[PDB]
């Protein structure tokens, strides 16, 4: 139930972990349903993330870094202002040291096949495929949505396009970067992204 309750990640977290809880109960004095601290999952499955040339990278590479979804759209001119600042910010992290510090998972709100690839050529980090259903799954997890067509469950629009949210292993939000938020500090909220505490386990 973190950060929200009515999320497709959330409903599959509880369903799968109580399924393994019922099996270990009948294979063995335990409490049901399991606690949220015992909620364990894989966020990105084996064929989700890929960089350029469409080659998949496993999530064992992602550990020890600070990964962050970049909910974006190539037609929204809020977002187009934020590409060269995010490209410059990501580039300077990864060059300055022995290892790569941050990482960006690109989540797209484009319209068709041509719209995704035209956006995808300007940036070097990872992505999730638009046609893969998990792009829709993470928007309704983080309440990141442009215009109201899908009914949110008593919540509001947490943020519109664009947004950079750093994530944890169990799917929780770690800190929100307020580009267009209650702070509205666009083009400078990327400096508030620390990486010592927001480490992907």
């Amino acid at each position: 139930s973190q950060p929200v309750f009515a999320s497709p990640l959330n409903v599959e977290k509880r369903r799968l972990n109580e399924e393994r809880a019922l099996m270990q109960a009948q294979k063995a004095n335990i409490q049901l349903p399991p606690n949220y601290g015992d909620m364990d999952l894989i966020l990105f499955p084996e064929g989700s993330l890929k960089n350029s040339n469409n080659t998949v990278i496993p999530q064992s590479h992602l550990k020890g870094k600070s990964v962050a979804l970049y909910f974006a759209d190539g037609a929204d001119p809020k977002c187009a202002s934020l590409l060269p600042f995010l490209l410059n910010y990501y580039r300077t992290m990864n060059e300055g040291g022995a290892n790569q510090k941050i990482e960006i998972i690109f989540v797209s709100l484009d319209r068709d096949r041509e719209a995704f690839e035209s956006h995808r050529a300007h940036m070097p980090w990872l992505s999730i495929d638009l046609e893969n259903p998990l792009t829709e799954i993470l928007k309704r997890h983080f309440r990141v949505m442009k215009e109201y067509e899908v009914p949110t469950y008593g919540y509001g629009s947490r943020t519109g396009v664009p947004s950079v949210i750093v994530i944890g292993s169990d799917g929780r939000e770690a800190q929100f970067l307020p580009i267009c938020s209650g702070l509205e500090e666009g083009d400078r909220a990327l400096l508030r992204w620390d990486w010592r505490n927001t480490k992907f386990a």
Binding site: S1, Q2, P3, Y148, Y155, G156, S157, R172, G182
Partner: protein, 48 residues
């Protein structure tokens, strides 16, 4: 005319959210120094 669907939240419910509790488990472990043996003699124990 179309009905524009409602979006909006109070500032209390967007900032005061339930939060991940801090993961604190650390006691103050101390190591006792071993006592050195009592190698001392009285004078009347030395020469008498």
């Amino acid at each position: 005319p179309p009905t524009l669907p409602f979006h909006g939240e109070s500032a209390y419910r967007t900032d005061y959210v339930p939060k991940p509790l801090p993961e604190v488990a650390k006691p103050v472990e101390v190591k006792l120094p071993p006592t050195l043996p009592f190698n001392a003699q009285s004078c009347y124990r030395s020469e008498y």
